[PDB]
Design an enzyme around this catalytic site. Structure first.
Site, PDB file in Angstrom:
ATOM      1  N   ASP A  65      -5.844 -27.389  -6.416  1.00  0.00           N
ATOM      2  CA  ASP A  65      -5.647 -28.171  -7.612  1.00  0.00           C
ATOM      3  C   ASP A  65      -6.820 -29.168  -7.746  1.00  0.00           C
ATOM      4  O   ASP A  65      -6.781 -30.238  -7.152  1.00  0.00           O
ATOM      5  CB  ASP A  65      -4.377 -29.047  -7.495  1.00  0.00           C
ATOM      6  CG  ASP A  65      -4.175 -29.833  -8.779  1.00  0.00           C
ATOM      7  OD1 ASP A  65      -4.966 -29.652  -9.735  1.00  0.00           O
ATOM      8  OD2 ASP A  65      -3.212 -30.629  -8.813  1.00  0.00           O
ATOM      9  N   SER A 142     -21.659 -22.095 -20.235  1.00  0.00           N
ATOM     10  CA  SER A 142     -21.254 -21.438 -21.468  1.00  0.00           C
ATOM     11  C   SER A 142     -22.217 -21.756 -22.598  1.00  0.00           C
ATOM     12  O   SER A 142     -22.914 -22.756 -22.620  1.00  0.00           O
ATOM     13  CB  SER A 142     -19.825 -21.813 -21.867  1.00  0.00           C
ATOM     14  OG  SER A 142     -19.742 -22.043 -23.286  1.00  0.00           O
ATOM     15  N   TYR A 155     -14.125 -29.356 -25.620  1.00  0.00           N
ATOM     16  CA  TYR A 155     -14.457 -28.304 -24.641  1.00  0.00           C
ATOM     17  C   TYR A 155     -15.974 -28.340 -24.443  1.00  0.00           C
ATOM     18  O   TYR A 155     -16.448 -28.279 -23.333  1.00  0.00           O
ATOM     19  CB  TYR A 155     -14.114 -26.926 -25.212  1.00  0.00           C
ATOM     20  CG  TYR A 155     -14.656 -25.751 -24.425  1.00  0.00           C
ATOM     21  CD1 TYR A 155     -14.151 -25.434 -23.178  1.00  0.00           C
ATOM     22  CD2 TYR A 155     -15.646 -24.942 -24.971  1.00  0.00           C
ATOM     23  CE1 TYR A 155     -14.679 -24.376 -22.461  1.00  0.00           C
ATOM     24  CE2 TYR A 155     -16.187 -23.883 -24.273  1.00  0.00           C
ATOM     25  CZ  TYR A 155     -15.691 -23.606 -23.008  1.00  0.00           C
ATOM     26  OH  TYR A 155     -16.164 -22.512 -22.314  1.00  0.00           O
ATOM     27  N   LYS A 159     -18.312 -29.175 -21.549  1.00  0.00           N
ATOM     28  CA  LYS A 159     -19.254 -28.163 -21.110  1.00  0.00           C
ATOM     29  C   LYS A 159     -20.692 -28.642 -21.071  1.00  0.00           C
ATOM     30  O   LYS A 159     -21.522 -28.105 -20.317  1.00  0.00           O
ATOM     31  CB  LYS A 159     -19.045 -26.825 -21.787  1.00  0.00           C
ATOM     32  CG  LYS A 159     -17.752 -26.157 -21.297  1.00  0.00           C
ATOM     33  CD  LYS A 159     -17.968 -25.565 -19.908  1.00  0.00           C
ATOM     34  CE  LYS A 159     -16.711 -24.922 -19.349  1.00  0.00           C
ATOM     35  NZ  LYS A 159     -16.708 -24.757 -17.866  1.00  0.00           N
TER      36      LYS A 159
HETATM   37  C1  EST Z   1     -18.537 -20.222 -27.321  1.00  0.00           C
HETATM   38  C2  EST Z   1     -18.114 -18.787 -27.624  1.00  0.00           C
HETATM   39  C3  EST Z   1     -19.352 -17.913 -27.790  1.00  0.00           C
HETATM   40  C4  EST Z   1     -20.062 -18.310 -29.124  1.00  0.00           C
HETATM   41  C5  EST Z   1     -19.118 -18.126 -30.308  1.00  0.00           C
HETATM   42  C6  EST Z   1     -19.766 -18.235 -31.655  1.00  0.00           C
HETATM   43  C7  EST Z   1     -21.117 -17.944 -31.854  1.00  0.00           C
HETATM   44  C8  EST Z   1     -21.728 -17.998 -33.096  1.00  0.00           C
HETATM   45  C9  EST Z   1     -20.979 -18.349 -34.186  1.00  0.00           C
HETATM   46  O1  EST Z   1     -21.574 -18.412 -35.436  1.00  0.00           O
HETATM   47  C10 EST Z   1     -19.620 -18.643 -34.056  1.00  0.00           C
HETATM   48  C11 EST Z   1     -19.022 -18.583 -32.795  1.00  0.00           C
HETATM   49  C12 EST Z   1     -17.561 -18.908 -32.682  1.00  0.00           C
HETATM   50  C13 EST Z   1     -16.901 -18.685 -31.338  1.00  0.00           C
HETATM   51  C14 EST Z   1     -17.808 -18.907 -30.147  1.00  0.00           C
HETATM   52  C15 EST Z   1     -17.170 -18.625 -28.825  1.00  0.00           C
HETATM   53  C16 EST Z   1     -15.857 -19.236 -28.391  1.00  0.00           C
HETATM   54  C17 EST Z   1     -15.864 -19.189 -26.833  1.00  0.00           C
HETATM   55  C18 EST Z   1     -17.161 -18.412 -26.485  1.00  0.00           C
HETATM   56  O2  EST Z   1     -17.606 -18.757 -25.174  1.00  0.00           O
END
Ligand code: EST
Ligand code: EST
EC number: 1.1.1.51
Lengths: 279, 279
Positions: A65, A142, A155, A159
């Site tokens: 945890d 990410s 988030y 991140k």
């Molecule tokens: C950040 C993510 C990758 C990039 C994605 C993206 C990437 C380009 C875009 O125009 C819209 C989105 C929406 C959702 C995003 C995702 C949600 C989680 C994932 O890791």
């Protein structure tokens, strides 16, 4: 075997794929400590493990945890081999929605685990790696930790925090021969209520929420990667003589990431991403 | 007067300079709510205020503990004019040292205030600005929120978090005509024990600490800005027809910031900064 590894958050997503990817390597060079928050979720781990026939005693379960200092302490001590040659900082949470709808208790939770929890692992495991003068730290990054995505405020916040935690430590760690790299992930192939969202938000914000929820489902389907490819960056990185700071699982995201760098003031990216999501 | 402003953390540094810079504007167009965490520190504020002769009832004191939701609530209600035309998110803390020496309770504190606290202000003050279809949010950024500085792990973490919190909200906020910009500050002209640091760290880490403490004192003296110049960006930004996302008080820092953008993998910047600090 030899390389003693301790992975966090292995009850699903990448962490799970990771442990099994290593536990069962043909060379049998890794011992693995897959850590679960909630032990009554060891099921999937073990099933998948049994499926690849990982030799017995090459994978181990530990509960851990990250929102708690003693657990991290205990987990550390169960590593009988007495070293953690490679540390993979992977517990992470998420949060979708208009900021104003997100409950405080939720936001706190997201940083305690993502950010603070990461640091607590580092605290306990950095020293001996400094001591020994060697080791590897792997952190699940990410694309949301390099550019903001509407409705993911906290988030992304959480991140970027690790991006800064890990770039600072990089500089210092250099001469100790202890390594730290981030695996810049994107959509990986891994699986609030409108009454409640709408309750706590202005309908125009809500219309945009919906609109976004609609755009990401699209983006997922075509950009999303086979988990086995995401995990393979990890091993590519824990095998580089001298790894870099960032490893990018995909390159799809570099173009938006580049034009974000050319205009520091932000109005370029804010604008492109804005239409990129809405219209 | 008119523009109703509510500044956070005004007992020193920039926030204090800011409140007085505005309270006393020759046009007398701003009412100011300088917020103090600890009220028994209103001294300096008031002294400096009395020195510039800010007309009476153009500056007001409110206590506001960003680590607490009710206080934010109460503070909100004392804004009698019933609107907060410009919100300046400035409470922030710092933390120096080798990660392993930093106490948990300290790290928690740094994100609760810097990150979470910022969000809590936003929560309470976003809605009505969305409602009214206008307003301005100003956030005190830093060069440490755009690139990692050895020994400042958690502050930087916490300073990138706001970078991500604010870039995400940017995209969404666009069409509401509610504005948000960050004031990328650097050293401004504003003012642990070796027994304890050394206690909790490996001497080689400690030698590097010292070394760094030695390099920043230098950097400060020659790069540091007159507070009155830092505060003037703020008003430059709350007066732009349509402001950008980032405002940079100085440009000294752009070169290192650029070569960080050209190589995403990080080994370039990590390396340059590494020698830039040590040798
Ligand atoms: C950040 C993510 C990758 C990039 C994605 C993206 C990437 C380009 C875009 O125009 C819209 C989105 C929406 C959702 C995003 C995702 C949600 C989680 C994932 O890791
Ligand atoms: C980040 C700061 C400005 C950039 C500074 C810097 C900038 C360049 C460099 O080589 C070293 C340092 C050390 C201290 C840093 C500062 C400490 C606080 C200040 O905001």
């Amino acid at each position: 075997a030899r390389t003693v590894v301790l992975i966090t958050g292995c009850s699903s997503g990448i962490g799970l794929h990771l442990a099994v990817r290593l536990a069962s390597d043909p060379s049998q060079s890794f011992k693995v400590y897959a850590t679960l928050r909630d032990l009554k979720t060891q099921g999937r781990l073990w099933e998948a493990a049994r499926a690849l026939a990982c030799p017995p005693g090459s994978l181990e379960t530990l509960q851990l945890d990250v929102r708690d200092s003693k657990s991290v302490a205990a987990a550390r001590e169960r590593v009988t081999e007495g070293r953690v040659d490679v540390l993979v900082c992977n517990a992470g949470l998420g949060l979708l929605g208009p900021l104003e709808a997100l409950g405080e208790d939720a936001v706190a939770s997201v940083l305690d685990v993502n950010v603070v929890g990461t640091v607590r692992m580092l605290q306990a495991f950095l020293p001996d790696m400094k001591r020994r003068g060697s080791g590897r730290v792997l952190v699940t990054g990410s694309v949301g930790g390099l550019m903001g995505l509407p409705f993911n405020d906290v988030y992304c916040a959480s991140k970027f925090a690790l991006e800064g935690l890990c770039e600072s430590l990089a500089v210092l760690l250099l001469p100790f021969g202890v390594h730290l790299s981030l695996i810049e992930c994107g959509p990986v192939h891994t699986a609030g209520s409108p009454e409640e969202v709408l309750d706590r938000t202005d309908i125009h914000t809500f219309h945009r929420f919906y609109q976004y929820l609609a755009q990401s489902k699209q983006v997922f389907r075509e950009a999303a990667q086979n988990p086995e490819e995401v995990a393979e960056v990890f091993l590519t990185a824990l095998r580089a003589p001298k790894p870099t700071l960032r490893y990018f699982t995909t390159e799809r995201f570099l173009p938006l990431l580049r034009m974000r760098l050319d205009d520091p003031s932000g109005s370029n990216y804010v604008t492109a991403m804005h239409r990129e999501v809405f219209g």
